Symmetry: C3
Subunit: 362 residues, 3 copies
């Protein structure tokens, strides 16, 4: 009656509250909550990024536009000349050449008190690579730089003889990309690169900031290469599927031949523009499990040099921010909270449950 009814009410209230708490915990585990731990991991060997050093886009280029005007065309219609038998799109995109052979990058690491800065010229030297911006040079930046001092830079240089044989370049475009993803160089160097003047010797400082996202069912992260591969394939195919044609331009990898018709070359170029502008939205990939963020700030330099193009990139800060989205609510945590709630709104343990099971088996 009274007593039994109230006892049943209380017991059912206890089970109801425990079940509601456990259900909320279970629903919390299904949607993995994520927190971020940010620490500064000082490393002695800095992983230098792979600098891309492009000229300004053909339209904004000085020397290439000068050649196009010499042939008698305006700053726009240089693709109305490629299928001319000798210009051979390869030789059109060789007219954007802003760097000459002598390009070489050194890797100064220390400072020394007798000799001076440790000039180490055996580091991976730069190679010329085609890009939407034209014909650039990619800085491999392969081996790591042993950070010792605030004077730890790679000094790119080019001693192109600047005699009055033809007008000479005004500025270049610098983009700091990651080791071996080919879409960063050949496509995204006209957008994400800094336009800086070669008239005077210009420097940089780079502080590295790394964001890491954990694998998670409702927000997955792919490794370094797989995102690059998916994005590059998307960009190359939709150029084809958005130009509704079949041919390529130097910045594309050798799938098909080189557009033996100017209208199709223009279609490819325009589709490239349209897809590169907004491949973040149209794509279906997500940021890597790592995310390098180079905080590139400028500086003045300590000495002049009569060199056509000069460039320093300082890495004086060896403490790198490391954000790491991580697993904050594990399955062990769920089981422990379930145990806590069943032992807090009750007296049930993992020994009483087995004891009742034993009683069931008589």
């Amino acid at each position: 009656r009274w007593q039994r009814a109230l006892w049943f009410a209380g017991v059912v209230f206890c089970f109801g509250i425990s079940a509601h708490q456990i259900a909320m915990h279970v629903l919390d585990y299904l949607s993995e909550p994520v927190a971020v731990r940010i620490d500064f991991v000082a490393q002695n060997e800095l992983r230098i990024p792979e600098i891309t050093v492009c000229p300004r886009i053909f339209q904004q280029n000085t020397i290439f536009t000068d050649m196009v005007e010499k042939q008698g065309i305006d700053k726009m219609k240089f693709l109305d000349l490629i299928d001319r038998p000798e210009y051979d799109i390869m030789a059109v995109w060789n007219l954007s050449r802003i760097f000459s052979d002598n390009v070489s990058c050194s890797a100064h690491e220390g400072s020394s008190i007798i000799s001076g800065s440790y000039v180490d010229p055996n580091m991976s030297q730069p190679h010329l690579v085609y890009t939407t911006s034209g014909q650039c040079i990619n800085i491999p930046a392969s081996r790591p730089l042993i950070y010792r001092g605030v004077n730890t830079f790679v000094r790119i240089t080019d001693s192109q003889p600047r005699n009055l044989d033809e007008v000479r370049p005004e500025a270049i475009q610098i983009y700091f990309h990651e080791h071996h993803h080919a879409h960063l160089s050949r496509y995204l160097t006209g957008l994400r690169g800094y336009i800086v003047p070669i008239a005077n010797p210009f420097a940089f400082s780079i502080r590295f900031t790394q964001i890491n996202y954990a694998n998670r069912t409702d927000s997955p992260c792919v490794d370094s290469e797989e995102y690059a591969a998916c994005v590059e394939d998307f960009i190359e195919q939709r150029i084809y599927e958005k130009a509704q044609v079949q041919c390529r331009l130097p910045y594309m990898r050798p799938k098909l031949p080189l557009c033996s018709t100017p209208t199709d070359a223009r279609k490819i170029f325009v589709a490239t523009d349209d897809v590169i502008q907004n491949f973040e939205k149209e794509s279906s990939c997500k940021r890597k499990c790592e995310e390098n963020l180079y905080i590139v700030e400028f500086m003045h330099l300590f000495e002049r040099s009569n060199i056509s193009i000069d460039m320093s990139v300082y890495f004086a800060y060896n403490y790198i921010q490391v954000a790491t989205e991580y697993l904050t609510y594990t399955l062990r945590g769920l089981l422990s909270d379930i145990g806590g709630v069943l032992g807090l709104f009750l007296g049930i343990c993992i020994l009483s449950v087995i004891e009742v099971f034993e009683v069931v088996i008589f």
Copy 2:
């Protein structure tokens, strides 16, 4: 005797230790502990700040001081000229004018592979605003910029004809303030602004760092607008209550007329200085629940322009630090810890407590 006494001692020891633990937890709840979670929230649309671009203070101004000397006064006593019938303090503070009509700011966002930076001149254009520094221009920066590339800037310009009709300005002062807080522009632009020369076309970069403080009884936070209203009202009334007079100067909002006596104008100016210097201490309000921190670092530019005043403000970094001081020890946390401690130094649950209550009711 022995056994009963020791049993009572043990029971009271357990009960007392549990009570001490619960009391410490309760006292931990009253003084809300606060932790901070720092994450990088990459946004595609950067919320550009409202740039204020003032000339140097009258004393340090070039052209205004030249006018004052022409009238036959020193670079301190220009307030001994305002109540002259025609100079009409408004027309005294129109002599600080460093910008001319033509002022217009554009918003380059993309980079493009043919055209170049996407010039979008339809954005909020700048308007002239009076300030303690004189007559300035405030950059509304209303619409957000769709971050795409590291070339995403708003370029302020002014093509004032620099003919030899009168000496021309040397430098300006830029202050980066939030959308619609009127105390920032009119008062705190002579203090918190960067003094940078207009001789050469200069550029800026800005990385946003946002600190969020949680509402908390012993350290409250007000929203964006309320703190600005508090500070502005305090600054304006104290100028009045610290000058012990009743009149205003152009930078103050239209409460009272324009100081038809030079001594009171000087009183107002001096009180304004003395209050803006130290309104942080005398005030009785606390920083917002949000706290935008623009990390303004300098750089060089990629192209010259024969324009009287030229300015770029780059926004190449979309990852923004977000510190969020938050509630770390909730009321549910206190209840669960109380349950844990009463079930760890005892065998009491919310089913045994109700059972004992039922036993009490017989």
Copy 3:
């Protein structure tokens, strides 16, 4: 039989699982896990670092090398002249003098609206200090600057008469070190200092980032001074134990006399170099419990000055990152987890254990 055997199996399973959990918790406490809390502590009084402003290393020095060539030596063998009776290594290292007497540094903090920047020249003035780089000047930077505005700098200057009596210096070397740690200035100023030209008046901005490491058995942290003392002692004695000689050069503390033989002076200089490049490895100390990281970024200035050497160091950012590695698994945490696991896989409380003890005592 059946029932008793299964009951024993269940009881032993519960005991084993509880013991495994408790052992894992205990081993988790023995290897203290460490997490980092990063908050921005708005500080009104910025603790300015102790700037060291050295000339470039002797061989890279202009004026000192000019003197060496005048005496008839190359820019390497200036130590083949020290024990000449009058050059008296002290007077060899007085030839690197790049600053003249008139050196004085001010501390501008505010901006003001009438007067202008608050020049406060009574702050600690600079003194000349010997260093491997030569004869430098050290900026005491003793009192803190009351941060008020984005114009809070200490402007170093030197008005040495630049008449055509002798060729004049090209650049200096700036190194930002902590208040009273003597191994920084005298040894690590040729390595960790920025080489920046004096030709034009340059400015600096510095944002402070502080990393704190908690004292911990398997990775101890010493206070600010003890690490500096240990590193200085190691560097100075190894120079002696690595040069296998007994004498010193001006940058060393007055332990022994000044190397009255050039071969020993060269031995000391070479041993110095060799140890300073790699004292991080050979030493046996670890980073302090403090770690100040000055984020020195460059910029332009607001006004020229016909001064031989001019320098600003802006401190416009009062929000300082404070990473604090801390104790995440306390002893109370271990005890509470042990209680939770023994009350979750069992029904044991701290009252039932005492009850069983009482039963033992009959």
